[PDB]
């Protein structure tokens, strides 16, 4: 009925792959040219696999145009970037095993790697019966997913069951051609294994030479349409090829023919007859008569009558005729060439045919390097393009790069690179504008710059854009330099070449690109940072929108990978130097957005990064700001209530910088005769009171503070509600206010004020933005809620009422449960303490699920327990419904801990609990002794079961979790204000006084910059080769490596063998 | 600002590894010897890595003892334990893929292994350039841990760009020396891949024979500088090894 | 006794058997190179 809802633009495998144009046929015999009979597929009978192979007659004045316009519109056929011509015998003959191996491994390896379109006789003799045979046992072997397509063209008057083929209507594309050859017809079949046939009528029957013009006009056809590509300098036309075995002196005729059109020539020695007399004609010497640009007549006093005569074995009727046309061919020695089976080792056939045409196109090196392009073969382009020979620059490689980039051809790009393009003076504005112009457009980025450049209505591409996707894919206030930098509006090069086309690698989401980029780079830690940022942060974008297909998982794994390289590269840079590692994490980046390492680090949720060692010793060194390393908790205590105390017992980092630099001064003696982070990673020194202010501003003193004041607070209100919360009166003075309570408001207005520049401080700069933010972390919900409890208990205080006075202690009598439950983001500094906290959280979810069905028995039991103790209406109905629906949770709960009521839901207690039914007397024991059973030992047990196997999965991710959250700790603790708990507030206003008035990093010198970055690049070079050869040294790799080896030592004793015989 | 804190005698790689002599310059063409004005160091256009190598223009006339201690002072040049110098061919010539493979892999096997010197003619052609190559591809397969040092002593008269690389001022340390050869100037470039250059002037332009005893005289200075080492008697004369593969009659004579 | 068990220890494992293989192998590559050159 209507179409099927495939996934379009979303998966690969659409069913679309699984009424004509003139299409004369002779069908008279004098002609007279009517529609075709014979166009659908061919179901050839039973040869393995379903292959349905289409077909076409045609008339032998057809234009070769019309025939391309069927191949590549009408057939879906896309368009190839080789084309193999094989010619040669047409009748059946024998190759010798090893060849006919090594023939049918070449062509298709050829085919297969380039995608290339294989042109055959189409018959199932001679020639085409190898190529066939080829195609066959290759596709057997590995299956039909790189479908190489061979075409067939020959002619109707010889095909065998012609009737088979014909239906004067449309609808032939059902056809059933067997393999039976009818009995005396003298005339080939079709070959089975040929893809697409093309069969040429003359209106006669039983000729054999009617398809060598089509042959030739489709050739010529398909050297002038040119190669998909998204540059338009890598659209080269596509290159013909001609590969010969055998034949007459017919194949050696076209042979000439075809080299006067500038298409090359292999022939494959070691076969019959015209392929070994033009191969031994070539293999005798080289003679340059006359210079004609490498001319060659291989014809001395010497060797003349040798190849009369092997020209005379076959053919004495006109020896002197092939004999000069077998002479003709050998004259250019850029278009022929020769196969021999003992020619080379490392050579097969597949690297003869793709040579020969870079043989072809020797005079222009830029040809060459085209089609190696085209072809997508690097192995190529190593062998014979780039050489010691000849020499490449910018201005040469410059479209070859560009074509690299926009098709994606990361190892070219690579190669290029690193033999001779410079990506100073390549990129321009224009280029990168032309990058961002040409995306793909089943990726991520066209749909976010289509939206941001659909609004305020701008046609053409430019930074500007870029920038803005850039800057809303990085919501931390980031700032791209496309929209400040002077380079990047519209000569002098771009600033950071390498940086921006990475970055456009790794918004296409190219991996092997993004990859090579990055290992050419100046900050590789940063880059790899801010990619894993970018990848998850479209993954998501991806997910959650409609507009934008789902590729979110492939984004999640190639930011997990620019994540490895990040800890990857910082693991090598702690080996080397465990300190300056530290200053390399702290350094203020100036091309990412005056943004350190660990800030990009913790943007991207890392916990990779966080966790490893180098973070977590500076954040201890951070923790300690400004203060000595062993400075414990208690001469902190002693010093900040007496800080005359300050100066003599608490060491500071430069005292001991200088004990260790004075001590290493000595050891190289003969044995015999808010600068903070300034005075941390320099060698700066602290007088008498900048060691005080140093003393007070570091985050660990501003802990023990908090800590000291949050004990105070805790007692404080802990008496107010257990000793003394009188009522208000005004009669009395004060209103009989105990001064505790207005101390108590002093403290919780101080909690109040510290939210409120907690809320203030968040990276967003917007209000919506800092709230969404604020309310991430589950501690600020219960920050608020308690603040808003007391507000609200402190307001219903004063207003002298039995009723909502009691409801003022109360409120006040329980919000003491989340003030002290409070107290666990204190306890949780703690290396052992912390881990378990956040262990406990994640244990909440199996709580929550068993507490779910413990509560659907606990009110079954209940329900019918009460049910039969206490009838509906009677005498011992209790003529209440509070009590009841309260009773009917009560009791059940309090008995799963033991508290049996055995008495009381018996006959006893009747003043107590309420006289029960004669039938409840004996009921409710055997309800309870089943309850006790599927509660206690059953429930209560699969609970201990539950929390045991969750405990060994959730201890190994809530270390990391608790790695990763001492960042925050330490970010909270060094924005907090200067002064101590008692007076805090005063401290607060400090901050106001600045703030009214209108962090954790270094500046660096340009010197210095340089230096780290050289330092870091080395260091991330140890680490790609490290991992190179690590994937290298595998078990499974060295075995590979040895049996290639093995088959290279069978192949030389072979040669041997042949040597000897 | 001030110093900043590196763990020192506790971790190896410190950030020292990422106002001069007498340094004769003949620039009058008889001859009025100058200060020098091209002595930074050489950003190859975009060949791989991050490699600045220094470089000197200076005199025939040089004492070979001031360029050894520019070396091994100023330069922060380690004292060799051997000194390669490869002598042969200045126009380039083919070697076998075979002999090839076994020619680099050999030389940086030496020099890697030994902690050794290669003394070149610098320039871009010849064997200077297998050289070149050999160091290339041999560090672009295991990286650069432990640094082969190439030291090209060639003659400013021929070398391109010379424009490039001159300087009046102190602080040529930035230099972005191109690959594209200047139209008509009939004289080689630098080979991209050597770490060290020695630029030989005599005043004249376009002659081949300055470099040939400035070559000499520092070979002759690096056969008296002692190896280091912790004992007195483990400290031997540097030996010097001389390596052919083509050359005339000339090489003929520098062998002998 | 000790020392030369780790010794073989250490020489037996399953890497360095197959690290030496692939050394004979090239060994045998380069003995069939000189024998071709021998031939031509
Ligand atoms: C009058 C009494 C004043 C007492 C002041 C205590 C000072 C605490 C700071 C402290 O000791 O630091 C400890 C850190 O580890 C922790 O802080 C873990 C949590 C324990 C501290 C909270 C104790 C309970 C008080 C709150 C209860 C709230 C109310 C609860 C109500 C129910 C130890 O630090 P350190 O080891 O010596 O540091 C040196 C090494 N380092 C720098 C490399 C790390
Ligand atoms: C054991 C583990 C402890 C756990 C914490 C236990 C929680 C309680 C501890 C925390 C709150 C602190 C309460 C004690 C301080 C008040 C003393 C007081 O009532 O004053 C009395 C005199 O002074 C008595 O010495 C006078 O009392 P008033 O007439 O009412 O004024
Ligand atoms: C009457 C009403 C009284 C209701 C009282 C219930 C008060 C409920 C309090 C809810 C706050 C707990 C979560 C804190 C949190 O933000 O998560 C943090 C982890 O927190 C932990 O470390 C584990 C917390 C377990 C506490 C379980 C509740 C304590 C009840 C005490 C029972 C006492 C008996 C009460 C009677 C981490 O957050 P994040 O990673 O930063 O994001
Ligand atoms: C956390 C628990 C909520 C704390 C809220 C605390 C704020 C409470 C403010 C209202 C207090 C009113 C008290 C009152 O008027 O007493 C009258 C008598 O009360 C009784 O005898 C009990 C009647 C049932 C009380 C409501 C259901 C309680 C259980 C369900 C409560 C849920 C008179
Ligand atoms: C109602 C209120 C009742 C009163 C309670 C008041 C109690 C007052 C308590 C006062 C004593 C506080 C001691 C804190 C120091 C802990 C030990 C320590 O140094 O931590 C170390 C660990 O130690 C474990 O191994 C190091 O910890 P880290 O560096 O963080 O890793
Ligand atoms: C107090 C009364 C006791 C019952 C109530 C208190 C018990 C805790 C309530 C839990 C709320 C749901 C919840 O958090 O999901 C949890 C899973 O559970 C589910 O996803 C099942 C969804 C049904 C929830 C409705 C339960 C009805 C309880 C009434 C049962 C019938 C009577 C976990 O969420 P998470 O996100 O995976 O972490
Ligand atoms: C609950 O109310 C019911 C109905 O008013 C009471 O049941 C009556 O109790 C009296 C006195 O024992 C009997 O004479 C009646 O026969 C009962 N009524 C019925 C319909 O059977 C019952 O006493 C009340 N229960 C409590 C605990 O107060
Ligand atoms: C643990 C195994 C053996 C199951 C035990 C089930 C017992 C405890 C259950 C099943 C039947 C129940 C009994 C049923 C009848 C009576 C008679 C009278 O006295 C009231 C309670 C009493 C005595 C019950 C006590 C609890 C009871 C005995
Ligand atoms: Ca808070």
Redesign the interface.
């Known amino acids: 009925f209507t179409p099927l809802y495939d996934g379009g633009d979303s998966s690969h495998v659409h069913l679309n792959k699984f009424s004509r144009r003139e299409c004369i046929r002779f069908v008279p015999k004098c002609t007279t040219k009517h529609p075709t009979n014979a166009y659908g597929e061919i179901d050839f009978e039973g040869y393995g696999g379903q292959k349905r192979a289409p077909y076409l007659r045609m008339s032998h004045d057809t234009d070769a145009n019309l025939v391309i316009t069927l191949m590549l519109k009408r057939w879906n056929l896309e368009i190839p970037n080789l084309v193999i011509s094989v010619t040669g015998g047409a009748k059946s003959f024998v190759l010798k095993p090893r060849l006919r191996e090594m023939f049918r491994r070449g062509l298709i390896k050829a085919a297969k790697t380039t995608g290339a379109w294989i042109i055959t006789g189409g018959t199932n003799t001679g020639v085409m019966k190898h190529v066939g045979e080829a195609v066959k046992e290759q596709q057997l072997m590995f299956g039909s997913d790189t479908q190489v397509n061979v075409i067939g063209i020959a002619t109707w008057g010889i095909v065998d069951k012609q009737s088979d083929l014909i239906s004067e209507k449309n609808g032939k594309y059902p056809a059933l051609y067997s393999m039976e050859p009818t009995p005396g017809h003298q005339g080939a079949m079709l070959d089975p294994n040929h893809s697409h046939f093309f069969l040429v009528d003359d209106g006669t029957e039983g000729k054999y030479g009617v398809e060598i013009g089509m042959r030739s006009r489709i050739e010529e056809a398909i050297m002038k349409v040119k190669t998909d590509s998204r540059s338009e300098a890598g659209s080269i036309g596509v290159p013909v090829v001609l590969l010969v075995l055998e034949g007459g002196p017919n194949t050696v005729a076209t042979m000439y023919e075809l080299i006067k059109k500038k298409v090359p020539a292999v022939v494959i020695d070691g076969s019959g007859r015209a392929a070994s007399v033009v191969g031994f004609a070539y293999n005798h010497t080289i003679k340059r008569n006359v210079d004609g640009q490498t001319i060659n007549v291989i014809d001395p006093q010497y060797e003349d009558e040798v190849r009369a005569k092997v020209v005379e074995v076959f053919g004495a009727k006109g020896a002197d005729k092939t004999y000069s046309m077998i002479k003709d061919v050998l004259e250019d020695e850029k278009m022929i060439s020769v196969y021999s089976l003992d020619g080379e080792i490392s050579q097969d056939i597949d690297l003869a045919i793709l040579k020969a045409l870079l043989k072809a196109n020797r005079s222009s090196p830029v040809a060459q390097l085209n089609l190696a392009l085209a072809w997508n073969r690097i192995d190529l382009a190593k062998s014979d393009i780039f050489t010691?020979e000849q020499?490449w620059?910018?201005?040469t490689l410059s479209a070859a790069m560009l074509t690299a980039l926009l098709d994606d051809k990361a190892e070219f790009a690579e190669l290029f690179?690193?033999?001779?393009?410079?990506?100073?003076?390549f990129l321009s504005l224009d280029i990168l504008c032309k990058l961002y112009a040409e995306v793909p457009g089943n990726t991520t980025i066209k749909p976010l710059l289509q939206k941001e450049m659909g609004k305020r209505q701008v046609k053409t591409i430019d930074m500007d854009v870029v920038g803005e996707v850039i800057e809303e894919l990085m919501g931390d206030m980031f700032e791209s330099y496309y929209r400040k930098d002077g380079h990047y509006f519209g000569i002098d090069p771009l600033p950071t070449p390498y940086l921006d086309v990475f970055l456009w690698a790794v918004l296409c989401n190219r991996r092997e690109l993004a990859r090579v980029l990055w290992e050419?780079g100046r900050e590789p830690m940063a880059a790899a940072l801010m990619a894993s940022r970018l990848l998850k942060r479209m993954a998501s974008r991806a997910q959650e929108d409609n507009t934008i297909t789902d590729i979110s998982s492939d984004l999640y794994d190639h930011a997990r990978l620019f994540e490895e390289r990040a800890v990857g590269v910082l693991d090598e840079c702690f080996n080397?130097?465990?300190?300056?590692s530290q200053?390399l994490l702290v350094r203020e980046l100036d091309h990412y957005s005056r943004m350190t390492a660990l800030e990009l680090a913790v943007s991207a949720e890392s916990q990779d990064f966080i966790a490893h060692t180098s973070c977590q010793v500076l954040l201890t060194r951070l923790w300690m700001g400004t203060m000595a390393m062993n400075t414990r908790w208690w001469k902190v205590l002693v010093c900040l209530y007496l800080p005359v105390l300050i100066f003599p017992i608490i060491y500071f980092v430069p005292d001991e910088?200088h004990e260790r630099?004075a001590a290493?001064r000595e050891?190289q003696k003969s044995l015999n005769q808010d600068d903070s982070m300034?005075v941390i990673?320099?060698?700066?020194k602290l007088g008498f009171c900048d060691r005080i202010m140093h003393f007070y501003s570091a985050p660990f003193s501003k802990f023990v503070g908090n800590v000291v004041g949050y004990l105070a607070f805790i007692f404080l209100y802990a008496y107010v509600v257990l000793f003394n919360f009188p009522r208000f009166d005004p009669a009395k003075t004060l209103g009989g206010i105990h001064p505790t309570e207005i101390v108590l408001y002093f403290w919780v207005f101080t909690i109040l004020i510290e939210e409120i520049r907690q809320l203030a401080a968040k990276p967003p700069k917007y209000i919506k933005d800092k709230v969404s933010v604020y309310f991430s972390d589950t501690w600020n919900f219960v920050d608020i809620f308690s603040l808003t409890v007391f507000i609200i208990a402190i307001i219903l205080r004063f207003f002298t009422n039995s009723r909502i006075f009691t409801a003022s202690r109360i409120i006040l009598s329980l919000d003491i449960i989340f003030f002290i439950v409070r107290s666990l983001q204190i306890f949780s500094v703690n290396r052992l303490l912390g881990p378990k906290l956040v262990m406990i959280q994640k244990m909440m979810q199996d709580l929550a699920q068993f507490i779910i069905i413990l509560a659907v028995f606990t009110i079954a039991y209940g329900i019918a327990l009460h049910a039969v103790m206490f009838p509906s209406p009677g005498i011992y109905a209790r003529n209440n419904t509070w009590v009841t629906i309260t009773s009917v949770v009560q009791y059940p709960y309090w008995q799963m801990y033991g508290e049996l009521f055995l008495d009381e839901i018996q006959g006893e207690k009747p003043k107590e609990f309420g006289e029960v039914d004669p039938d409840g007397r004996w009921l409710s024991p055997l309800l309870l002794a089943i309850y006790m059973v599927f509660t206690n030992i059953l429930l209560l047990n699969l609970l201990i079961a539950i929390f045991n196997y969750t405990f060994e999965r959730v201890q190994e991710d809530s270390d990391k979790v608790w790695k990763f959250q001492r960042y925050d700790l330490v970010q909270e603790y060094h924005s907090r204000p200067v002064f101590a708990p008692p007076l805090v507030l005063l401290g607060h206003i400090l901050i106001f006084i600045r703030w009214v008035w209108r962090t954790m990093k270094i500046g660096?010198?340009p010197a210095?910059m340089e230096?780290?970055?050289?330092?870091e690049?080395?260091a991330a070079?140890?680490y790609?080769?490290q991992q190179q050869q690590k994937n290298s040294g595998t078990?499974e790799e060295?075995?590979r490596?040895?049996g290639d080896?093995?088959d290279?030592?069978n192949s030389?004793?072979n040669?041997?063998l042949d040597?000897m015989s």
């Open positions: 010691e020499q620059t910018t201005e690179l690193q033999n001779g393009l410079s990506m100073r003076e050419a080397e130097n465990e300190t300056l200053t910088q630099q290493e050891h300034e990673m320099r060698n700066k660096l010198s210095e230096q780290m970055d050289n330092w690049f080395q070079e140890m790609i080769h078990l060295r075995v490596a040895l080896r093995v290279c030592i030389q004793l040669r041997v040597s």
